[PDB]
Design a protein around this nucleic acid. Structure first.
Lengths: 238, 157, 137, 120, 52
RNA sequence: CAGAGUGUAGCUUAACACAAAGCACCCAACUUACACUUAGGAGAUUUCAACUUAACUUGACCGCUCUGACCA
């Protein structure tokens, strides 16, 4: 064998649920593009209906020459009122949920406009270290397959993940402390694989102490400075 | 001249791809993928066309060959809703589905993970992304149906 | 009967294996720019410049003028950048250029031209007229 | 009465001239050159010069191209160069920057067409 | 309806600011691709040494 | 942490001085799109003391890539 220990890590990421809010500069550009679009657009059927209805009122008030009585029951402006009333009654979903208010970094319902990365807490040498989910490589199994096996080893989860490619997205090599450092086990070589969380969530048995979901900006709170640097390379915050 | 050392200085066709005249689908190797179709489905025509332009420009900057950029036929579906205290379906709105397809090839297996990550992160709201391997059926779906050929084929059956 | 070329043939550096992946010119100007540079380079075959170009002496021309002035490049560059930033900061200057109404003072430009590029342009202009050829051989 | 280098009808540009106006536009600078047929540059005007750069908001726009033509026309008169030819590509001629530059050269007194050679 | 002088000036300045904004977006995206590519290639080299 | 190397914007053995250049890049129009074209947009010498020269020489200095320590 080799002195280093093969480890296959899974970089499970939750894609954003809602679109990111526009920047103040983009809001100005968005209004201009909408303004330009209206200027260069032809009259729509709704616009043509309003113009003709206004003319009919003039053709009915200035002179009594109109030869039709029924005309149209509902005017264009009146028709807009019905649409406006329905919109007010309808309530949109809350982009910022209770998880954001309570800072519940366990649920997936937080920061729907950002990217969440799964983190778990594992105890090594009577020390709690936050690392990405990982498992030891076994004979007769691909390196990517170990990461797939890591998902099945989680604490009561029915999550489905979509792996992208076979080559690892990154690596992290560390050596054990000199107290237990031996030639047989010099250290370990962690390999990261990214996947997309399609559906599923952990059960309500254990939440706070088991796993957390944080973005790249707040990812440094849990990871070690040496471990954080390697993770921040293959994890984007676009 | 042939005997002079400057022979062949004027040769130019060896620097030009031979263009000597539908298209055969080239399957990828064990390390590269074959011809891929990047479908872009959205209910807004502007969003579908704009993102297809973004994908087309992204591939050029990534040195990924683009086989062809084309638009699938627009699908129009009527939307009807049931009236209150009634059993009659009344038309509510008309929705048109616009699909834009960008065809690429020669994508590396290792680079596929990076390419797919970038495009999915930039996907606009209301736009559906679907990347499929190019097949003969997909290409044949862009052509008008031929009932006359079908009628003759039915006789043979 | 064939004779090997006396030197590197044109287009020999082009890799024909990856011709599809090689970047093309795609434009007339880009090819023309490369063509002009290629023509000026010396070649081992017969060229137009061989029979029509002036047979200048290979030795460098003797300079018999006053020594060049000493100018601090670091200080000169810093002042010029400051002047540009002040000019671009003006809203009217940006608007005038955007509206294509701006202009430069020819008298002010020439006065600065006499102190910076004047003597060098005059030497080139006098060289064209052959004053150095006749006055100083 | 001097011979113009006639020929080169299958290539571009033509060599049948005495002096030509050659304009070089780059990503950040615009340069205009008046060079003899033998290849010697007679006069030049470039936006790289601090004399012209200090008075230009941008050295890559139509104003810069028009300004170079005004400066070059003054230098051409001071150099005795009154006649020259211009050989633009179809897109360059239709460009607004070159039209302004040609107008500046014409308004400066320089004629953009050389007189024909006298053979008899 | 013809745009006023102030309205045209506002749009022109906005477009100039838009060019710089999109250039910075491309730089962030281009560096993101480079960061992923460097990490993936370095990881593959390390994996090959450990177990071909 | 230490040691070693490295130093113009993305690239460049561009920078004699007259000068921080050439290309790559970004928006817009044209283009289904790309491309060409036109018309625009943004850029750098890590910093300082040494014929005051000096992007260059040397030092310091800041940053940076590597070897190990360090590590779960």
């Amino acid at each position: 064998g080799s002195p280093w220990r093969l480890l296959g890590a899974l970089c499970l990421q939750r894609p954003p649920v809602v679109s990111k809010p526009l920047t103040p500069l983009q809001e100005e550009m968005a209004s201009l593009l909408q303004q330009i679009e209206i200027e260069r657009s032809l009259y729509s059927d709704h616009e043509l209906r309003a113009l003709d209805e206004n003319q009919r009122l003039a053709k009915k008030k200035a002179d009594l020459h109109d030869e039709e009585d029924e005309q149209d029951i509902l005017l264009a402006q009146d028709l807009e009122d019905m649409w406006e009333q329905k919109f007010l009654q309808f309530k949109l979903g809350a982009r910022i949920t209770e998880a954001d208010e309570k800072n519940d970094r366990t649920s997936l319902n937080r920061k729907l406009d950002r990217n969440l990365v799964l983190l778990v807490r594992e105890k090594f040498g009577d020390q709690d270290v936050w690392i990405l989910p990982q498992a030891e490589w076994q004979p007769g199994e691909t390196l990517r397959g170990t990461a797939e096996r890591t998902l099945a080893t989680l604490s009561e989860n029915n999550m489905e993940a979509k792996f992208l490619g076979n080559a690892p997205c990154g690596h992290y090599t560390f050596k054990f402390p000199q107290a237990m450092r031996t030639e047989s086990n010099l250290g370990a070589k962690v390999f990261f694989f990214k996947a997309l969380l399609l559906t599923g969530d952990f059960s309500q048995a254990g939440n706070k102490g088991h796993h957390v979901w944080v973005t790249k900006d707040e990812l440094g709170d849990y990871l070690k400075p040496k471990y954080l640097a390697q993770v921040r390379r293959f994890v984007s915050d676009l | 001249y042939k005997t002079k050392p400057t022979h062949g200085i004027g040769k130019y066709k060896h620097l030009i791809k031979a263009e000597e005249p539908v298209r055969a689908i080239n399957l990828g190797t064990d390390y590269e993928y074959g011809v891929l179709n990047i479908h872009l489905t959205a209910y807004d025509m502007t969003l579908a066309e704009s993102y297809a332009q973004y994908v087309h420009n992204l591939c050029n900057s990534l040195s990924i060959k683009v086989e062809e950029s084309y638009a699938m036929p627009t699908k129009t579906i009527e939307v009807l809703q049931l009236q209150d205290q009634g059993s009659k379906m009344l038309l509510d709105s008309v929705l048109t589905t616009h699909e834009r397809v960008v065809q690429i090839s020669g994508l590396s297996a290792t680079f596929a993970e990076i390419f797919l990550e970038i495009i999915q992160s930039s996907l606009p709201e209301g736009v559906r992304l679907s990347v499929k391997e190019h097949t003969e059926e997909d290409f044949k779906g862009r052509f008008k149906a031929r009932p006359e050929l079908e009628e003759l084929l039915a006789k043979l059956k | 009967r064939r004779t090997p070329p006396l030197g590197p043939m044109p287009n020999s550096d082009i890799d024909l294996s990856n011709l599809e992946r090689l970047e093309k010119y795609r434009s007339f100007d880009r090819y023309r720019r490369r063509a002009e540079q290629e023509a000026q380079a010396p070649h081992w075959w017969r060229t137009y410049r061989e029979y029509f170009g002036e047979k200048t002496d290979p030795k460098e021309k003797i300079d018999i003028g006053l020594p060049p002035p000493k100018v601090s490049r670091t200080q000169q560059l810093l002042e010029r950048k400051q002047a540009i930033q002040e000019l671009r900061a003006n809203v009217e200057e940006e608007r005038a250029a955007r509206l294509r109404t701006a202009s430069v003072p020819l008298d002010a430009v020439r006065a600065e031209w006499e102190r910076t590029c004047g003597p060098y342009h005059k030497q080139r202009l006098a060289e064209y007229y052959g004053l150095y050829r006749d006055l100083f051989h | 009465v001097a011979r113009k280098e006639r020929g080169w009808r299958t290539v571009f540009p033509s060599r049948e001239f005495w002096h030509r106006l050659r304009v070089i536009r780059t990503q950040h600078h615009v340069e205009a050159l008046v060079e003899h047929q033998n290849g010697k540059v007679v006069v030049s005007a470039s936006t790289r010069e601090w004399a012209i750069k200090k008075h230009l908001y941008s050295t890559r726009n139509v104003v810069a191209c028009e300004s170079i033509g005004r400066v070059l026309a003054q230098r051409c008169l001071e150099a005795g160069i009154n006649f020259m030819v211009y050989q633009p590509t179809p897109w360059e001629a239709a460009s607004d920057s070159m039209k302004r530059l040609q107008s500046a050269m014409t308004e400066g007194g320089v004629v953009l067409r050389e007189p024909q050679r006298i053979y008899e | 309806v013809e745009l006023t002088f102030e309205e045209t000036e506002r749009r022109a300045l906005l477009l100039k600011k838009w060019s710089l904004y999109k250039q910075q977006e491309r730089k962030m995206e281009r560096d993101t691709i480079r960061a992923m590519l460097e990490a993936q290639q370095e990881a593959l080299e390390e994996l090959q040494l450990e177990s071909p």
